[PDB]
């Protein structure tokens, strides 16, 4: 009976990355691979072992990306892409940051965007004194149907009311909203 002893494989293998701001080093040198996983059980083992985003020192990031995609604009799968951005105020560090981030992780590993989950590259949480950010990165900023489907599903999974609007920005511009939902 395979069900009783095999781990549950995920559709993709994922890599978790950590960034710590250190002014001595370049941005790329501050980015480090923590580990990879490709089962539900190994996901939770990693998540349960690491700090909540709300407990990270200001200036740190977590990134969860499909194995083979580095969490940087320069990666072949990100250079023509962009991000759905969730901007948090300082009070939301306490109320929403960790629950939004875990919901974002599950959207990725559970492949929650139907046919368009293949357009997903990964997600990033930035812990910053001026206000935290969470973002889902996708591979092609010109694929309007894929980008807007991901954005609408993401907004509903986060539980954001219609009085909130979230925006999608291309990395080429970051390096202006193209879409809003
Ligand atoms: C070279 O500087 C860039 C960014 O200007 C710098 C800060 O990115 P970042 O840490 O995303 O900005 P925040 O601290 Se949330 O603050 P604002 O976005 O300015 O409100 O971090 C570097 N950086 C940030 N990212 C995401 C990248 C990247 O993908 N590739 C490269 N080459 N650099 C990146």
From Swiss-Prot:
It comes from the Eukaryota. GO terms for biological process: behavioral fear response; cellular response to dexamethasone stimulus; G1/S transition of mitotic cell cycle; mRNA export from nucleus; negative regulation of neuron differentiation; negative regulation of translation; neuron differentiation; nuclear export. GO terms for cellular component: chromatoid body; cytoplasm; cytoplasmic stress granule; cytosol; eukaryotic translation initiation factor 4F complex; glutamatergic synapse; nuclear body; nuclear speck. InterPro entries: TIF_eIF4e-like (IPR023398), TIF_eIF_4E (IPR001040), TIF_eIF_4E_CS (IPR019770). It is found in: Cytoplasm, P-body; Cytoplasm; Cytoplasm, Stress granule; Nucleus. Phosphorylation increases the ability of the protein to bind to mRNA caps and to form the eIF4F complex. Phosphorylation also enhances its mRNA transport function. Acts in the cytoplasm to initiate and regulate protein synthesis and is required in the nucleus for export of a subset of mRNAs from the nucleus to the cytoplasm which promotes processes such as RNA capping, processing and splicing. Component of the protein complex eIF4F, which is involved in the recognition of the mRNA cap, ATP-dependent unwinding of 5'-terminal secondary structure and recruitment of mRNA to the ribosome. This is Eukaryotic translation initiation factor 4E. The lineage of its organism: Eukaryota, Metazoa, Chordata, Craniata, Vertebrata.
């Amino acid at each position: 009976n395979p069900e009783h002893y095999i781990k549950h494989p995920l559709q993709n293998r994922w890599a978790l990355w950590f960034f710590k701001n250190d002014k001595s080093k370049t941005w790329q040198a501050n980015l480090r691979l923590i580990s990879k996983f490709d089962t539900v059980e190994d996901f939770w083992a990693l998540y349960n072992h690491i700090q909540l985003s709300s407990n990270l020192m200001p200036g740190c990031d977590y990134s969860l990306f499909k194995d083979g995609i580095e969490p940087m604009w320069e990666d072949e799968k990100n250079k023509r892409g962009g991000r759905w951005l969730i901007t948090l105020n300082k009070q939301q560090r306490r109320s929403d940051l960790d629950r939004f981030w875990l919901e974002t992780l599950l959207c990725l590993i559970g492949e929650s965007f139907d046919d368009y989950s293949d357009d997903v590259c990964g997600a990033v949480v930035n812990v910053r004194a001026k206000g935290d950010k969470i973002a889902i990165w996708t591979t092609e900023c010109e694929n309007r149907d894929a980008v807007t489907h991901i954005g609408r599903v993401y907004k509903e999974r986060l539980g954001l009311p219609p009085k909130i609007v979230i925006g999608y920005q291309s990395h080429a511009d970051t390096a202006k909203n193209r879409f809003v939902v």
